[PDB]
Structures are given as structure tokens and as C-alpha cells.
Design a protein around this ligand. Structure first.
Ligand SMILES: [NH3+]CCc1ccccc1
Ligand SMILES: [NH3+]CCc1ccccc1
Ligand SMILES: [Cu+2]
Ligand SMILES: [Cu+2]
Ligand code: NA
Ligand code: NA
Lengths: 620, 620
């Protein structure tokens, strides 16, 4: 009965029928995106209307469409023809992955390049890479993918060990034309394999690891009702799933005594981008938006008990649409479980004689996605003490190149002849804030150093200052680790027992933001990634920091367009957008398969409660 | 048989007898510090000599002594009389904790202050606080503690809820004289209790937490031999324990195939300091060095199975000396266990069809100490993938004051009338490095941004630069989060298969360093805390960043004295000193007992191995 419930197979089958009947799902059509729309603000009228948004691609070159349909009312609400030279191309289709390799396999320029390197075309895999927007005027309005080649020695070989450098091709996947084949020189194809299941590479496997058994003999402490509504240790929330964003958290709230107190209305990773820092023409165009161009949710893995998730696991199996509107279950796509988290609070008092120890725990909601060479785990954590944390875990295989004779300032060597270009992995968290309700504001908090002198005679004092961000034009903020800079989201109309506004503090990891030159194409297309923190006024249609159609969009859409409205954000319905990322100079230890590295952020209560909220936790 | 073995009860009893026989342990003597000395460099002659260092205090006002004794040879090696006006006072004795309260309880000025506030002297606890060095010339050469008062309403009451502000006393604990009683005004004693085991405060305890059972049915994967030698998943090390530093890690090494490869010779937290940022004369002198002034190891807790450490736990019970030379066991003072740590590596390959997942785990070595109101857990982690991590967990009760009517720029309000002054918790990790042996060097690594232009026509390139630190005068470094600054410790004479020097990268959290004015007493006494990274040339006697005798030392000893020698550190036996800390603006949620907050650092291999070192981990 909940409007925030997951999409069902039947809902998607109804959408397909509505689209078909309306003439919008002919045999040349493909669904490139399908997702449920969130309820509008002020839907508390209790009139459920399950609406879906659909992007429809046309493989014959007709104009794609954006369609909204109501499954509640069985009708098409709106259907808009898109001009992609203007607003951007639709996301990459899974079925286009193979089309780049097959189109090149009959191109005479491509075959000529492979023949000069003595490569059998049947062994050559071609990565289908998003094109971006660069200097090629013939690409405007065309659906382009670029291809980089890797050799597979045999069908189980790891092709990433064998990049074919000095060669790139551009393909129009609608008209099935190879527009350009660039061959800048022959590089030796690196010879060593990277087959990390080969006993010859792994050596004998360890016999020394003894099992760790994690069990919950009376079951888990959380309940799941209505398919996706979680209650756990005073927390309440709904777990959603979107094919673009992946796991989305709705209605995060905390039961403080009798009141259910809202904290976050909607939390998601709304974009991610991987820019490469290699100036070679073979790769200098390479930047993929896994979220906005490829849709990370449709590549979610089926997670295996005991391998991917350990302990007493509850699964959710979200349903998405395939390219024809058929429902597709992602079996065991979301893992949910609670984890011991060490000591929560501890004190042995010399004067009272009381010895006090309490254990912490956290609720984990996670999913794992794979897009080509890279694999990412997205983890949301809820802690007993009111802390909310996000963690991204990056693993998979690094994207490779040749390592040039005589070295490189922008590539590291992983193996003889084998290089890994420098790159970043940058995420945008979109936090639709609702601290005790919707009237919120953001303050920037800096440590303040004080000089020795009158009133500070021993030179020990220090303080802090808070600056309210009142309008969108002043709410684009940078990190400053040296001044301990954090941001507090408060509700000026909701006070704690000390008559101070209730709040939550955002703690960032303060990693570098986008390194590319501010005049570059990527700095325009990924403008969100150039600053650590943005605050906007909530609006229904301002969903992604990069805009709705990221693929081949020329830049400036999303956040820099939103904030030009200069709306009032001082005690209003606001959205915080936090940029965070990893700068990756690949190491030898990252090869042939990369150990997990992590990045994230956390929010901690800041005078939200009237005292510690974990005084009622028992002693195990 | 290992020279790095823990001190035994019999060794300490032998030391006591040697001291007694030599006339150094008369009835006016107290042992203020006793610890085993590490073997000297070049002890590979196989001639074990177990030597102990002893600080001896004299309660009758005679000069203290520093004594070194050999239990192997039953002799006193050296005995030096100390001039404490010059080199510093000895650490605080546990038996002096009560002396401040008892001396004040008969002082007419003290009684007059309490009577004006209607406080029964029998209910007034006095914290024994280290004095530092300020403007009082009569304190030079005297053993001074300062006292701040708290009211206990009944013997099980939490006195921290009831600070007596506007009152401080200074005491000479050797001559048993109250030197000064300062009363700057009456403040209401805050009335609410902070008794976090009181059902009236906690409410009904939760019934919703179900048990998490962590077991190892075939036992743990690590072995302990020789009392304190650990082998676990290719790691090798010795766990030491020192009454000043706590847990110390020796001879950290990793078995890479057939070679045992050294990584760190000695790792410890060598100092910590808590400076307060309240300019009130009542507290503006307050800075305690829990390590150097109080000795955190002698306050280590006995850790309870299932409460403090959960899972399959192996304990170590270290032995220290009491004030008279008797051995004192700290039962269950060190917890050792392995922990599941999620996904280690994962990839599903679109071209090979191979699906690959491996689990991570970590080895945990931990202890917990309590000094007055504060409690700290020290955690060392070893991971499968070669990562070493330290984490400090701060909890306990915040140090309190009155909250002034009309507010404060340097104190936060926790309850009606009750304040918590701003402060920092700053740690110094001392890492005696041994990356593949003792010829090491440190490079500082910054990200380098590049401008659009020739050779970088699309403005996407970025790079990195490494600066070798060649002499001690240039090896005092600051963090720079914005440039992704890290430090690499390498061995220029040991190369990986790519002919690159092997190394480890130090990743800092980049929290603010010491905030006090550079001209303050604390900035001189805690000079290490003003910079993030120092590198020195190894020397036997350069043990602590603050010097051997921190209590009441006037400043400048330790690191700023060491680095003035300007020694060669480029491919030499070097020591890295990393400052890291938390800046604490107390929140309401920190009261009446504080949920754990954390800080730390990690080291990750950087071309130390020839490929991922976890290819031989099995699939569970
Ligand atoms: N992550 C999106 C880029 C990509 C997609 C498919 C194969 C290799 C790389
Ligand atoms: N942590 C060292 C300071 C201290 C010592 C004893 C009581 C309160 C405070
Ligand atoms: Cu990467
Ligand atoms: Cu603190
Ligand atoms: Na909002
Ligand atoms: Na060294």
C-alpha cells in the first residue's frame, strides 16, 4: 500500500501494454530507461498515482521520446519527442555493447590496423566507450561510441592484460557506420596474461585461513514490511531501487521516544564519473559516467550468500524492465544485514566505581554493480548512535594501455609493457534533506584560530565560526581540511531542550575534486565534480547533477543551471549535493585484479537529540 | 628465548632486588616508570642482555634518579641523579591522585571557597591535573599538581555532572603545601545528574536487539609462540607492552614467497596530548599528556569477553611494576582476534565469463586505557592485502565546566548550566621504518594539475610529483588535502620486478594540527603537534617526540631538538613521526557518556609486491 514500494513485475507489464497500445513500442523501439517517479510534494491527500518515466530509443534513426505513464490510470500522461543535438543522447543500451566490435570487424581500415599487428580479428574484443563531446562536428546529433581494442588469447583469457594501443575507432551505432579509424603507431601488445584464477599465477592456494562463522540464532533485529520498509533500532526507512541510480533510500527517520523524527527525505548516488588523465589522443577523450551514461542499477550483481554477504542476510530482488518492456528480476540484488561494530561507549570511573561498556552495531544495505572492467559496491550504514554513513568500494580490473618505452608522466607501469593511465572516480551524493521536517538551512563551520593577547593571555584559545548559506549563488562550497571545515544542516524552527536548532553535521573525506583544466570538455560536462558541496532549493525536476541526458551532452546542464536561479535556501526545502572521490595512481598491487579501495562520507547528529540517544542500549 | 619477549614477573622481581641491594629503593623511593629496553642495533651477535630502565622518585624531596639495570647480569649499569628544574619532573604517580584532594581538604582558603558555595567538603572530588609550565616562578623545580573540583552527591554519583567552576588550587605534592587558591567568582554547580546507569535517565532498556554470534569452530587462523610472537596470513610480528606507550609492535614483516620481508621495525603511539581551548584562568593552563605525564599503559583495562572483545579472542596479560617494584599482572589487558572485513576483490567479466569474489579479513590487536574522565581504545589492524592501519577510539566522559550565562565562544552547552570546553586529542605515532631493510627514504607525493595547451590539448591530463626529503632540516612537513598529499617510504636499494624501488604509502586523515598560538607554552611543549610529519635519523635515545620527562618541562625538548642535528635521511635508518588528532567541539549527544569517535592513519603497499599479494586467497 506504500507509495514508496518497489516496482512490481505486474506494474512493468502494464507499462509495456500502455506503451504498445499507444503506438510507442514498435519493433524499432527500445526502452533505454524505465523508473518509478517519486510522489510529489503534498501528495498527503491520499490519492496514490503510480507514475513511470520512460526513455524510448529508435534503432531506425527516428527521434527518441520521453514518456510519462500512470499505471494507476492506465494512461499516457505525456510523450515528448527529443532533439538529441540539443538535450543529449539517451543512455547506452546493453545491446549496443557488441555492436561496436561487430561493426569494426568488417571495416577495411580496422582490419588493416589489426593485420599490421598480426592480430586475428576473431580474438579482438572492443570496449564500447561513451564518446563525450569534442572537436568532431560530424558527431552532433549522432549516436556515437568509441572503441578501444583488447586481445583475448582464448575464450577464458582476461583481455585487459592485452591492450592494443595506438588505435581507436569511432562508430555511429544507428546508421552502422565507422566514422573514423585512428592509428597513431604500433605498440607491442603486452604478453603476460592476467588470469587471476590460473594456478600458475596464484601459486598454491592458502591452507591457513580458518572459518569465521557469523550467525544470529534468534534472527535479525530488523523487520521488513510492505516489501521494502525497514525498522531497525529506532530507525525507519524505505529501500528503493532505480535502474539509473541503484539503491535509493527514502524517508529516513528516527523514533525518538514517541516522535518519528525525519532526517533525510531521499538519499542516492545521483552521478558518478571516471575521468582519465592521459593526454594521448588514443585516450584523452575518455570519461565515462557510469550512472548517467550506462545506468549502474541494470548491471547490479546477484549477490551470493557466504561470498558477497556474510551472516544472517535478508535479500531484496528488484524488478527492472528489459529493452522491450519485459520485467526482469535481479535475484538477490540487495543485501541487508546488521553487523557488530565494536565498542559504542565505555567508561570505568575512579570515583563512582561504576564500570560501563556497550557494544555498537550497524545496519548495512548494499549492492554491487559491474560495468565492463570496473566493479563497485555501494554501502549505506545506519548506526545505533544516529550516524549515517555511505561507502563506495572500488575493485575489478584497472583500465590498461601500453606502457611507453621511456616512461610516462600520466600512466603507471603494472607489468612488462603494460600501463594503467591515471584517473579519478568521482561520486555525487544527492541528499534531499528533511531534518525534523522540511524547513532546513546549511551552515559552513570553520575552526577559528585566536592570537595570544588580551582575553587570551596564554595563547590557548580557539573557537569556531558558522556561516549560513542564504541563497543558491553563495552555496557552492570548497573543502578546507586545514580549518576542519564541515557543514551543518539544521532546522531553525525545531529546537532541542537547550533552545538550540537541531542539526546534523556532514563530515567529508576532503579528497581532491576534479583535476582537469577548467576549460576542458569534462569540466563543463561534470561541473558538479569541481566543488565539494552544492545546496539547491528542492524542485521536482532537478534530479541529477549532470542533467537528464548525460550521453554526448555538450555541458553546463544540471547543477550550474539550477543554482543560477538563485533561490532562497535559508529555512526552506533544500537538497545537498556532495562531491567525493578517489584519485587513482595505479600501483603494481592493483594488478591483475584490484583489492578494494574505499571512499565516502558520514553525517552525525549535532544537537539533534537532547542527550546521547543510546542510553537505553542493554549490556549484551 | 626471544629478546623481544614480554617482561616476566620474575624479571621485575629481580630488578626490585638489584635496586634494593644497591641502596636505590629505600622506603622514601617510588618507581615512577619501569620498562624493558629494546635491543641495540647490531645485537645480532647473539648475546642476550635484558636491560630495564627505571625512573625513581623520592617522596622526601631528594633528587630523583634514572637507573638502567641488567637482569641478565644482575648489575646496575648506570644511575644518574636528575635536576628536575632542568630536565623535567617524573611522571605522575597513581598514589598522588588522592593527595591533591586530601591536602586541600584541610586548607583554610579551600574550605572558605567551598563554604561560600555551601558544599560539604566530604562530597567534593578534586581532579589531579598536570601543571604545565606557566608564569609562576615558585614552581620551577617543584612537583606541582593543579586541582579542579567536582561534587559527588552520593558515592555512586557521576561527579563530572557537577563541576565547581571559578575555583582552582595549585599544590606542591612533595612538601605537602597548597601554594595558591584562586577563586574568581561563584558559579551555580550544575544540578542535573549524569548517571547513565540510572533507569530514570535511560528509560526502559531496549528489548529489540537480537544476538550476533561470532565464532571460529576450528579456532583462529593466527598462532602465538614464545608468549608474544604472532604469525597470521603471511604477517609476522612481536607484540610488546610498555607502561608508558602501551602496546608496541616490533618486527612487522611479511612472508612473500620464501623471503621474510621487513616492513616496520617498531610501531608505537609515543605521545598524546589534550590541549584545552578555554581562555578562562580556571582552565587556560589545562593540557595533559596522557602518555608522557600519566603513562597510559599502567591504566590499561582488563577486557571482558563478549563485552569489550567479541569472537574467538586470545588474550595477553602484560606484567608491569607497581610503585614498590612488585610485579603487577594486567589480566586480559590485550585482545587479539581476526575479523571478517567484507569483500577483498571482486569482478564478473563480460568477455571471459569468469565470476570472481574473495573475502577480506583483518588481524586486530587492541587495548583500552582509562585516565580520569577519558577512556581510549588503541587498535592496530593488519589486512590480507598488506595494509597496516591504526585507529584510536575516544569515549568516556567529557571534561566539564559551568556554562556561563550569556554564552561562550570556547565552551559548548551540554545541559542546563553545564558546559564542555573545546579541546583537541592529538597523537604522535612513532614508526621506526624498515622497508625491506634499514636503508629507507621518504618522498612527499603531490598531485600535479596541468594546464590546457600543447601536449595537453583537451585539458584532461594530470600527474604527480615526488620530492625526496634528504636531510632532517627539510623533513618537517604539513598536510595538503587539496593536492592529495601523501608520503612514500621506500628502499632505494631494493627493487620490484619493474626495477622500481619498493615502498609503502602513508595515508593521513588530514585533521587540523595544534590550534594554540605558536607563542604559547603548549606550542613549545608539544612542538610535534604543530606539524603532520617529521622524519628523523634513528638514534637509540630519541624515543619520544616530547623528550623523556614531559611533566613540567619548559619546552623544546624532543623532535625540534633532534632535527637540529640535520642528519642525512636519504637511504638511511630513519624514523617517521606522524601527528594526527581530533578537534572536539562537544555536542549534546556526547553527554552524559560519549559515543566513540575515531581517528587514525594507514599505510598501504606501493610497489612493494610484484603483483597483488592476495592472489592465493581461497574462495571460502
Ligand atoms: N564503465 C563504462 C566503460 C566501459 C564499458 C564497457 C566495457 C569497458 C568499459
Ligand atoms: N587524563 C589525565 C587528566 C586527569 C587525570 C585524573 C582525573 C581527571 C583528569
Ligand atoms: Cu581506479
Ligand atoms: Cu574530546
Ligand atoms: Na529537502
Ligand atoms: Na628505521
Amino acid at each position: 500500500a506504500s507509495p514508496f514500494r518497489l516496482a512490481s513485475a505486474g506494474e512493468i507489464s502494464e507499462v509495456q501494454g500502455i506503451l504498445r497500445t499507444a503506438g510507442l513500442l514498435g519493433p524499432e523501439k527500445r526502452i533505454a530507461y524505465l523508473g518509478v517517479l517519486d510522489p510529489a510534494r503534498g501528495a498527503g491527500s491520499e490519492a496514490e498515482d503510480r507514475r513511470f518515466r520512460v526513455f524510448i530509443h529508435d534503432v531506425s534513426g527516428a527521434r527518441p521520446q520521453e514518456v510519462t505513464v500512470s499505471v494507476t490510470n492506465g494512461t499516457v500522461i505525456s510523450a515528448v519527442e527529443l532533439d538529441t543535438a540539443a538535450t543529449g543522447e539517451l543512455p547506452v543500451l546493453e545491446e549496443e555493447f557488441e555492436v561496436v566490435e561487430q561493426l569494426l570487424a568488417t571495416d577495411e581500415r580496422w582490419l588493416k590496423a589489426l593485420a599490421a599487428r598480426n592480430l586475428d580479428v576473431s580474438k579482438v574484443r572492443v570496449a564500447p566507450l561513451s564518446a563525450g563531446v569534442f572537436e568532431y562536428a560530424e558527431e552532433r546529433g549522432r549516436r556515437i561510441l568509441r572503441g578501444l581494442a583488447f586481445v583475448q588469447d582464448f575464450p577464458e583469457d582476461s583481455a585487459w592484460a592485452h591492450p592494443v594501443d595506438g588505435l581507436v575507432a569511432y562508430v555511429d551505432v544507428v546508421s552502422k557506420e565507422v566514422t573514423r579509424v585512428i592509428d597513431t603507431g604500433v605498440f607491442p601488445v603486452p604478453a603476460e596474461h592476467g588470469n587471476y584464477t590460473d594456478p600458475e599465477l596464484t601459486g598454491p592456494l592458502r591452507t591457513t585461513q580458518k572459518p569465521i562463522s557469523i550467525t544470529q540464532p534468534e534472527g535479525p533485529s530488523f523487520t521488513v514490511t510492505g516489501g521494502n520498509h525497514i525498522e531497525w533500532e529506532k530507525w525507519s526507512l524505505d529501500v528503493g531501487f532505480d535502474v539509473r541510480e541503484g539503491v535509493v533510500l527514502h524517508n529516513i527517520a528516527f523514533r525518538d521516544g514517541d516522535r518519528l523524527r525525519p532526517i533525510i527525505n531521499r538519499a542516492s548516488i545521483a552521478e558518478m564519473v571516471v575521468p582519465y588523465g592521459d593526454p594521448s589522443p588514443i585516450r584523452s577523450w575518455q570519461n565515462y559516467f557510469d550512472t548517467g551514461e550506462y545506468l549502474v542499477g541494470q548491471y547490479a550483481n546477484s549477490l551470493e550468500l557466504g561470498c558477497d554477504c556474510l551472516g544472517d542476510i535478508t535479500y531484496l530482488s528488484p524488478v527492472i524492465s528489459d529493452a522491450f518492456g519485459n520485467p526482469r528480476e535481479i535475484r538477490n540484488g540487495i543485501c541487508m544485514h546488521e553487523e557488530d561494530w565494536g565498542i559504542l561507549a565505555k567508561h570505568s570511573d575512579l570515583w563512582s566505581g561504576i564500570n560501563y561498556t556497550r557494544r555498537n552495531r550497524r545496519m548495512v544495505i548494499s549492492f554491487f554493480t559491474t560495468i565492463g572492467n570496473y566493479d563497485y559496491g555501494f554501502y549505506w550504514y545506519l548506526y545505533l548512535d544516529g550516524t549515517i554513513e555511505f561507502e563506495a568500494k572500488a575493485t575489478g580490473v584497472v583500465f590498461t594501455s601500453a606502457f611507453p618505452e621511456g616512461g610516462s608522466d600520466n600512466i603507471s607501469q603494472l607489468a612488462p609493457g603494460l600501463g594503467a593511465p591515471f584517473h579519478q572516480h568521482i561520486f555525487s551524493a544527492r541528499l534531499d534533506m528533511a531534518i525534523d521536517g522540511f524547513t532546513n538551512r546549511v551552515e559552513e563551520e570553520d575552526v577559528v584560530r585566536q592570537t595570544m593577547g588580551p582575553g587570551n593571555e596564554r595563547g590557548n584559545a580557539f573557537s569556531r565560526k558558522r556561516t549560513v548559506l542564504t541563497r543558491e549563488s553563495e552555496a557552492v562550497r570548497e573543502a578546507d581540511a586545514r580549518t576542519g571545515r564541515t557543514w551543518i544542516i539544521s532546522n531553525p524552527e525545531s529546537k532541542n531542550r537547550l533552545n538550540e536548532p537541531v542539526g546534523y553535521k556532514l563530515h567529508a573525506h576532503n579528497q581532491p575534486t576534479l583535476l582537469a583544466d577548467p576549460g576542458s570538455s569534462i569540466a563543463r560536462r561534470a561541473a558538479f565534480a569541481t566543488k565539494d558541496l552544492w545546496v539547491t532549493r528542492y524542485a521536482d525536476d532537478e534530479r541529477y547533477p549532470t542533467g537528464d541526458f548525460v550521453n554526448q551532452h555538450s555541458g553546463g546542464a544540471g547543477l550550474p543551471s539550477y543554482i543560477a536561479q538563485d533561490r532562497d535556501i535559508d529555512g526552506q526545502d533544500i537538497v545537498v549535493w556532495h562531491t567525493f572521490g578517489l584519485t587513482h595512481f595505479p600501483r603494481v598491487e592493483d594488478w591483475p585484479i584490484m583489492p578494494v579501495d574505499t571512499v565516502g562520507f558520514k553525517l552525525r547528529p549535532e544537537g539533534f537529540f537532547d542527550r546521547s540517544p543510546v542510553l537505553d542500549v542493554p549490556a549484551n
